[model samples]
Target: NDAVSGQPSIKGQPVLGKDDAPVTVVEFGDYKCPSCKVFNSDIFPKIQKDFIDKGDVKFSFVNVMFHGKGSRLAALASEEVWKEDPDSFWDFHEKLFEKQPDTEQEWVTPGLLGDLAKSTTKIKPETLKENLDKETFASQVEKDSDLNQKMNIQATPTIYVNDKVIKNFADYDEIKETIEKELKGK
Candidate 1:
């Protein structure tokens, strides 16, 4: 259980939409996965247009720092921003994706993470720094970490639409189609 939510829930800010929508999409992702970067950069705008912006679905970001230290640092920084401003969390999320440096040569450090946090308007730099030190959201990350272990998610960008896991990552349209089909059944 995360110290913040005290339940097995994803830690980061969920991209909530359509409070009463019959369908929910849970996206389990990492910050440093190249494929996650591809999905976020390439397909997310389409997702916003097709589902979130139109109210056809609800999305929750279940961030799992499975990649490495840099990934974990990124998740921690975003969660702190989320604590400060839930509505602006998506902005912070997008910013992180957009500003990711070439971390292949070195692990993402606390300084780099702080730089990302510093660039956001959602929280003051001091508070962001404090949260990072206090690991204010560590417990939340742990909760999802535990859940991911239980659920056996092995890769970033693993998605679950309603209760079903779409096996093929190659077909992004399947995500939209699966939700539509499930919505009709309801």
Candidate 2:
């Protein structure tokens, strides 16, 4: 079990596409964030299909803990899922963002989380609860937080367009434009 979920196989941050791909887009997002959810549900698919699938760009999704406990829960769950079931991880990720609770208050607790697991996940509800209770992914969560803080990430969906910080998150077109530009550079 430790062999499977103990450590990240690849060194450095999460990435998409071939490891040596010329262009990389790193996004620091909080799972509970509405804007992050918007990006995930709306924009991310197109980006993934167009760039990542085509091997033109690599996207790294770094989970941040700025929003609240839900952010932490999401980060922890994602890491665990990555280790245990890589294929199912994205399914769980999509489900999580889409099924985000109505309120931010008490959104990451065991009771609510159990419901999430039972309803949307194939993994055992008890396992998800235990993982959260033990906080097995605490170090990874801290590392992500520290990395963002060092990079001066102050928002829910801070994007790095090939090592450049994208200051604006309000306009989706600008983000697409950035991605297109980076893709051309590749």
Candidate 3:
């Protein structure tokens, strides 16, 4: 239980912003989850503008493998891209969600991810393709999933502000309020 679980490690997690920022926003997400897409498309930009870009909060994303092969593939691709260019990973991450196919859609092939990475970021297509084909980051993605399991996470877009789980993920207003609240004493 969170009541007893240790502070979640940020090591190897795909993150955005200064590591020592006063507040940390951790998100557990899956590429194939529609709600996650909604969050990325809708609320994330606001959070990015108000908090992340302003240097008020640190953001970390941990992939959860709840949507099958495509999810895992996307997660692994994300891992590799993060390794290649931490600065550009968020751009690529947003574009992946923008281009996300319907649930269980077969369109998010490894080939497609390579294409997206090439078009959206500085990551070379060849490198992305090679890693996707070889599943270079598969183990790292699995480790993220294992962490999710250990934390008892059950849904995509499960967000944590300073290690406290936010239950109102669907309400952007609530998320903002919580963040503002958390920032008060930090």
Candidate 4:
């Protein structure tokens, strides 16, 4: 068994950091997953400051709809935001995690995303609602779901530091070490 795997073809995903960074990190995430929120808050900021902002590492996020309807809807809403403005996608990403409540509560509604889109994007809230209501991103969202499933990536917030898969991704040291190792090209 190994702690690493490779899948660098992240062309369509929402990305952060420089386009030509030395290292690439990816997180296969479910929007309604609580642990995904934890990584978003607890570990990712350090990674951002130390690597992403430094132009050493680039980060990407893929939506994996493991929580049924809420997962699918949140993923769809996120796609809409990313479509409108790739830069504003992360703002909506932060907003969704910030409002994460009972995962079973079905909190990710069209109205909720409409508010977030209004607050975070130049696009009108009603437009976001229309997009969500119509499930406009369903086709796009399905691809990530299929990809994750095809790869057997069941864990929420499963992160990849280069080709290395860190399933217990909340640990910053492990993540840091992996990044450093990749940086060294070892």
Task: For residues 42-83, write the lDDT of model 2, one tens digit per residue.
Answer: 878877887788877777777788766767877887777666
Error of 1 at 102 (Å): 5.0
Off by over 4 Å in 3: 1-7
Deviation from native of the Cα of residue 136 in model 1, angstroms = 2.2
Give residue 182's error in model 1 in angstroms. Answer: 1.3
**Alpha-carbon runs more than 4 Å astray in model 4:** 1-4
Span of 10 residues, lowest total lDDT, candidate 4 = 1-10
RMSD, every candidate, angstroms: 4.7, 6.9, 2.1, 1.9
Worst 10 residues of 2 by lDDT: 1-10
> Weakest 10 consecutive residues, lDDT, candidate 3?
1-10
User: lDDT for every model?
Assistant: 0.70, 0.70, 0.82, 0.85
What tens digits encode model 4's per-residue C-alpha lDDT throughout 1-186? Answer: 332367646878899999889889999898899999999999999999999999999999999888889898899988888888787888889989999985467788888888888888788999888888888889989888777876578678889887788857888989998899999994
Q: Which pairs of residues have clashing backbones in candidate 1?
A: none
**Best model per lDDT:** 4
Residue clash pairs of candidate 3: none
Candidate 2 Cα outliers beyond 4 Å, as residue runs: 1-14, 111-122
Per-residue lDDT over 45-145 for candidate 3, one digit per residue giving the tens place of the 0 to 100 score: 78889999889888888898887788888888999888988778988999889888664655567788888788777888888988888898888987997
- Report how far residue 73 has shifted in candidate 4, in Å: 0.6
Model 1, poorest ten-residue lDDT window?
1-10
| Residue range 34-78, candidate 1, lDDT tens digits | 677777788777767887778877778877886677777777777
